[PDB]
């Protein structure tokens, strides 16, 4: 119904990225607080922005988890990529984890310039990872340059089973794939011999 140059009809298409499910993770947004990255049709990660923490200790027993080797390898890869993509992460107490029984629970404590804080780096990483539908929960307190601030105190990542969660944004692999190149790009040195 929209004709250009009298002879060119403007037509559209929308890709069903859901069909990529077997070969790459797909992230989507359910609402402001709930976002998902699914791996196949059986498992995935739920990422929740929330004021309610579920971990109240300072441990993240990554090496023991590796030794026990009970987790889903793809999910551990996604966790590793997310954490390695955070810029200027320098407060190890802000990250707590539970990996017992092969489960994955990771909790980033966003409480507190706001730019040079773990909250800013973690939330920028979350914006990239959950790209599409992140914007509604993000940049409530507008910061300088690319800086992000929200009113949430925690970002929680836990494993979950497949469900039709993509009410706000369509599933897409773009965020994960884009974050793959960000890995280790902005990590600080913590010792002389890496």
């Amino acid at each position, epitope marked *: 119904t929209s004709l250009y140059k009298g002879v060119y009809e403007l037509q559209t298409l929308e890709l069903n990225m859901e069909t990529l499910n077997m070969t790459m993770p797909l992230s989507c947004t359910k609402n402001n607080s709930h976002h998902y990255i699914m791996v196949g049709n059986e498992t995935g990660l739920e990422l929740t922005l*929330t*004021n309610t923490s579920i971990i*109240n200790h300072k441990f993240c027993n990554l090496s023991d988890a590796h030794k026990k080797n009970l987790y889903d390898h793809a999910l551990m890869s996604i966790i590793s990529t997310f954490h390695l993509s955070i810029p200027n992460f320098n407060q190890y107490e802000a990250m707590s984890c539970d990996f017992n029984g092969g489960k994955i*629970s990771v909790q980033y404590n966003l409480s507190h310039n706001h730019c040079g804080t773990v909250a800013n780096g973690v939330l920028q990483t979350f914006m990239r990872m959950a790209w599409g539908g992140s914007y509604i929960a993000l940049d409530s307190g507008r910061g300088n340059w690319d800086c992000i601030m929200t009113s949430y105190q925690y970002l929680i990542i836990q494993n979950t089973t497949w469900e039709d969660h993509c009410q706000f944004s369509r599933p897409s692999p773009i965020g994960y794939l884009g974050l793959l190149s960000q890995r280790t790009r902005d990590i600080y040195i913590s010792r002389r011999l890496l």
Partner: antibody
Amino acid sequence: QVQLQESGAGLLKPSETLSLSCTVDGESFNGFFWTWIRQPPGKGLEWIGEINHLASTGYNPSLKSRVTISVDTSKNQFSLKLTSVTAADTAVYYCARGYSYGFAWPNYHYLDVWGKGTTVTVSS
Amino acid sequence: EIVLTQSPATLSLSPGERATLSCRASQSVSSYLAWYQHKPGQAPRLLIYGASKRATGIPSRFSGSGSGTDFSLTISSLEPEDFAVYYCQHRSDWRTTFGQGTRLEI
């Protein structure tokens, strides 16, 4: 339909250890803060503490050194131990299911399912 | 730490009257308060949560309001079974606190 059944001896002598357990039948076990509260005679409600399915805990400071709360997810139960009980620990003890919503403002929290309650008295 | 002070200590009211109970927080609340009713010989019952939402089975005569540091529970036309002790409760991260309670009697 959710029930919480509380078990544990309520007849104690000073310096002993109170051991209570609460079993949950009905609905899920994750995502709730399983909570211990107590009411001393002639007093109000007093929060003892809470625990979730990851064994993360929160305790009332005034009892921290003496209180331990544990969980057993295999049979959906959670337990409270108070060591070296003195006369200040005589009270009715309740287990309760707490739910916290922190996904949007206003956040809220409540204890919606309560157990019957166990009287605990310490004397010589 | 956030504490809750309830007002007044006790209330003397007749059936059919309007009951208003206040809860004051020492600072702006981390989450909206909840209100419980407690009678001797039985467990406390959740009446209100989120400062304005009735729990399951709570009659419509129970209402709530408030924000910041000031919260209130209202019984429009109080029934004879509404005479009990009422508690406001708050939760910050991994810390739950109760108000001292208000006694509502005939």
